[PDB]
Design a protein around this ligand. Structure first.
Ligand SMILES: [Zn+2]
Ligand SMILES: [Zn+2]
Length: 220
């Protein structure tokens, strides 16, 4: 029994985000089902409806899992991924940083950077290799950062309604970094995710008076 939140788009259509765990999310919009970084360790993916779309941010095992992909795919599922993950899968569409994809009529995708800035942590997520995604449904823009630190390109993110930022150590962001990241583009709604054992409640305090709705969900 996973929690989920619902959002209305400008024409009245509904987007529901179901919070699975870590960086794993299911998005439901207009009777289409979208899985992001589905990982079998966090759910029995045979019990979900079959993915119309599977989004992979990068190749690490807590994001790219073929078993989970098999359990939830159908014959006409489109997999959208970074180059390294696509290669490992042997199927799917490759997006690089700066790519826009407008070929799904109900969901525009933009691939944006997601990498480490701390010296020595490029061993984790080196620049260019991995993607964050901006998903647009009828004007509603959802930014899924993937694994990144408070990179300067976040200043370039415009009109984001909902954002997911990663807040664990040493792989992604500390609470202060996440707060700094959030302030760079002012999403209306912020879901910290991929936060492991971080005491994430401090992010609400850290963004007090920012005007950003920080929503804590079970996304360790
Ligand atoms: Zn990673
Ligand atoms: Zn990760």
């Amino acid at each position: 029994y996973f929690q989920g939140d619902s959002f209305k788009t400008k024409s009245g259509k509904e987007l529901t985000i179901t919070f699975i765990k870590h960086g794993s999310l299911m998005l439901t919009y207009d009777n289409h089902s979208i899985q992001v970084d589905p990982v079998s360790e966090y759910a029995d993916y045979t019990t979900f409806p079959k993915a119309d779309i599977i989004l992979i941010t990068h190749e690490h095992g807590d994001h790219l899992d073929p078993k989970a992909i098999q359990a939830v795919e159908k014959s006409d599922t489109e997999i959208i991924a970074n180059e390294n993950s696509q290669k490992k899968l042997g199927k799917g569409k490759v997006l690089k940083n700066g790519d826009t994809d407008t070929s799904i009529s109900y969901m525009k995708i933009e691939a944006v950077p997601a990498y480490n800035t701390t010296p020595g942590r490029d061993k984790y997520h080196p620049r260019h290799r991995d993607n964050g995604y901006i998903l647009t449904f009828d004007g509603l823009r959802v930014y899924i950062a993937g694994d990144t630190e408070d990179i300067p390109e976040m200043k370039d993110l415009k009109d984001i309604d909902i954002a997911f930022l990663p807040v664990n150590q040493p792989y992604t962001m500390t609470v202060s970094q996440a707060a700094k990241a959030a302030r760079m583009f002012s999403p209306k709604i912020l879901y910290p995710y991929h936060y492991g054992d971080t005491k994430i409640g401090e992010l609400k305090d850290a963004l007090k008076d920012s005007g950003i709705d920080v929503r804590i969900r079970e996304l360790q």
